[PDB]
């Protein structure tokens, strides 16, 4: 598709700070503009400027593409790259270019159509021998950085722009590895005839004879407008020159400083719930992890191993030291989980993948499968050597009890990770509210004094201590015959039908909360 | 002085990968040498082998200084920096730097000569503006990564070498700041006589034009050998002509591809914690660790609050939590210290800084007072609130158990952190031991099984309890004459003595296991 941008006398008055006083070019499809310029000046915010991300009073000046006031209707055919590429580490870069082919394209297709077109990008970006293995990140053994550069172009190859604003994709790589990421774009405005438009920081003498246009700003009023080939022949004939061998970008950089609709939404779940899964038991099934449940499931199951229902103090702490490992637990492994992935959120969310709702969902439907094996798998081992109450009717409501209040605390890490999106200063936060929900929970305090009794309501360890107890003893009432106390601790308190009731109103309470949280960022 | 460096056939066999097959060349007392490379060629392997950091059976040929055998006489007059500069984030560049001048310069000397030759350094290599702020890192508000680099310069301007190997002191920072990062690295070489030899990454047209020597090797067999201004002039001579303007560099860097005693140590100790002690109240001083404590300050001295000690049960929850809160939390935060400074040691320990008993000792004094300063304003506010056994005489004696508690349980997590020398695999087993220490406390079991009895003897958390309680009770015999139970709870176990004895056997044997730990890095 012919896309002419050109862009008449842009400004900028940002805070007050004069960026641009000016810009003015022509980009044509089969035109492999460059921007070059020097260190902060003016290149990131022409490209934002030019790919639209920027807007509102401080933008003035027509920004015309084809000759066209900028809607979203001429935002189709843009794609603008971004400089950090924020891909999931866990995924295949078939796995990360399909996922994506599922989101963004339109819905009106076919499965297998948005499934080779994420395999024709592959075969064309040069990414077809590293397909079948995982993208990684600093810690995890993955691909190049030169091939995490060509799937984040790839992510905007799948709206099929003509229009590619690349913002430096050669910053932070080799030297014959952003010489082959070059003849790939120069080949995108050569062979396909798309219009690409790229900021390369600090070229290459081959990278440079591989620009066709290059428009050269010092500070904001566009020195040079024209084809790289002839950049020196421009200012030879002004008036500069270089006095020794340059690479001819480097002469011009110097002088540039001056030195001289609901199925639409229950399969955007179904793709975010699929693509979010390996990243769900990499969390939940971390080495790590399961070794501090392994130990604690040995050292809760010899402590108390073959323990007596008589001994009802022995039985109050065990039933306490579970409430407390299991609220400690999940309330603070889902408290990194959205600060972790606010990056990818924005800038998918703002692509037209998702929009928040089937986004937060994938993260709840999710983790409520994940972290669901882990205690499972701890009150299975530690119910037949800890001798608690035989029968498969008090088995499973201890499992029921304690399942719904792994999940009801984990709700507590979404809220408070969500409304302070840091993952430090919401991870000290929600070790003071569960130290506030242990100390009342019934177990330390029995002698609570009038005024702080409105603190044991709201806790979230109170409601699974109070059923476990009664579970394992019940309303007192039989103990007391083999017995010959257990009143203050055993019985008197809310029941076990308000004490389940609380306990989904801290499921759902905690994730409408969560979610009213992510709703301004 | 003049050092006159050259090297005759220079072989390396590593793990079998031949890569040096090659090397000679002659440096000179003002020959500004840069040896100019590809990727992992040969570039940081041939900068060790010349300063003599890497040696053994796989070093093969003379390495000769002034013609001269390498021994550690011609090694005071080396200074080889690292790439990764590894300063201390929280002093200022007059601090980082006179206290290394105090460290690594010869004793024999006066405190101001040793406080001058830090600072001609200063205002030499162009730090002087810049140098009443923090260094920082990537989270502290501090220097720039072009002044970062000119810090660890000083660190090696400070032995006064005449060799001086820079290990590609370009790589990561601008270009109007590696730019004038080299002319003071040339104006060394002809200013003041130095003999630099320095590795760049990827140079720039002047940066080129401003190398003395130039010394390029493809692969290990040195295809250049001369100086950079005559680096065209022997190519051309051969075969090799660029067919595009290109910059010097860049023409070779793809032709190398083929593309065409007492009083010693005692002052080492006070240098050691007088610097270390801006790390160690950012440590203990944290704002999320200041608000950990006083939010369990609110909390346990309103839940607690005007507590009777009649109240046997509720009193014994009271001194547990404060043996579970001062066990968990300094043993946590101990386990990060000698993980986050073993780059920091290993480089300053192996340049005679110190040698590991002095930087240890400093570790330990210097976390022996910034960690007792929470616990002491805690058990201030939560003993008269909370109401405790009132007198000087039992407040005393409950806050020299306590300092002491956290003191021997921080010692835990200086052992861990040392044996497991990975700041995360060591906090996982850190709070798996500290999980077995609270359960065989003596609060949660009381029946514990017969061959569970030998875990408790050995847990820290167990000597703290057992000594807060007879503080508060004593060895029972006057709350019975108030009650009218409690022999199985606050009577009949090991002593106060006892438990005195071991919480210093636990003090100092955790903290030789520490240094015991720290002795094959």
């Known amino acids: 598709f012919p896309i002419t941008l050109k862009f008449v006398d842009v400004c900028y008055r940002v805070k007050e700070r004069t960026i641009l006083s000016g810009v003015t070019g022509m980009i044509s499809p089969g035109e492999f503009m ?16 030019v790919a639209g991300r920027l807007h509102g009073s401080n933008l003035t000046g027509k920004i015309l593409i084809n000759d066209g006031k900028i809607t979203k209707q001429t935002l189709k055919r843009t794609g603008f790259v971004a400089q950090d590429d924020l891909l999931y580490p866990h995924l295949t870069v078939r796995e990360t270019l399909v996922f994506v082919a599922l989101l963004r394209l339109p819905r009106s297709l076919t499965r297998d159509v948005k499934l080779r077109a994420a395999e024709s990008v592959i075969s064309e970006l040069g990414l077809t021998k590293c397909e079948n293995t995982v993208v990684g990140n600093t810690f995890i053994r993955g691909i190049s ?56 920081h600090q070229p290459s003498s081959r990278v440079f004879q591989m620009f066709d246009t290059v428009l050269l700003l010092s500070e904001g009023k566009c020195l040079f407008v024209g084809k790289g080939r002839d950049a020196m022949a421009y200012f030879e004939s002004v008036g500069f020159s270089p006095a020794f061998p340059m ?31 390996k990243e769900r038991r990499h969390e939940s099934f971390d080495l790590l992890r399961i070794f501090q449940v392994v130990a604690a499931s040995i050292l809760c199951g010899l402590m108390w191993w073959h323990s007596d229902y008589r001994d009802v103090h022995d039985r109050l702490g065990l039933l306490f030291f579970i409430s407390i490992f299991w609220g400690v637990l999940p309330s603070f492994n889902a408290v990194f989980t959205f600060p972790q992935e606010r990056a990818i959120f924005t800038r998918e969310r703002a692509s037209g993948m998702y929009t928040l709702s089937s986004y937060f969902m994938a993260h709840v439907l999710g983790s409520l499968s994940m972290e669901l094996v882990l205690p499972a798998s701890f009150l299975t081992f530690t119910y037949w050597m800890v001798y608690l109450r ?70 979230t360890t109170f409601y699974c201590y109070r059923l476990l107890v009664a579970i394992q003893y019940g309303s007192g009432e039989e103990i007391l015959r083999m017995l010959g106390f257990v009143e203050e601790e055993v019985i008197g308190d809310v029941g076990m039908w308000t004490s389940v009731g609380v306990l989904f109103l801290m499921f759902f309470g905690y994730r409408v909360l969560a979610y009213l949280a992510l709703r301004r960022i």
């Not at 172009?153 to 952003?178: F, K, M, Q």
């Open 145 to 200: 950085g030169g091939e995490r550069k060509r799937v984040s172009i790839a992510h905007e190859l799948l709206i099929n722009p003509s229009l590619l604003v690349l913002d430096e994709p050669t910053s932070g790589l080799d030297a014959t590895a952003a010489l082959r990421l070059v003849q790939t774009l120069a080949g995108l405005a050569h062979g396909k005839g798309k219009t690409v438009v790229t900021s390369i």
């Open 247 to 277: 690479n001819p970008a480097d002469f011009l950089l110097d002088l540039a400083n001056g030195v001289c609709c609901i199925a639409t939404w229950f399969s955007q779940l179904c793709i975010l719930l699929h693509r979010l899964l």
């Open 390 to 459: 035989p029968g498969i009717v008090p088995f499973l409501l201890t499992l029921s009890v304690l399942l719904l209040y792994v999940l009801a605390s984990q709700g507590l890490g979404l809220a408070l990770g969500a409304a302070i999106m840091d993952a430090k200063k919401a991870s000290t936060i929600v070790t003071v509210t569960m130290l506030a929900f242990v100390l009342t929970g019934g177990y330390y305090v029995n002698k609570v004094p009038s005024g702080m009794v409105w603190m044991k309501y709201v806790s």
């Open 34 to 49: 460059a921007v070059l310029g020097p260190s902060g000046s003016g290149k990131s915010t022409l490209l934002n400027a």
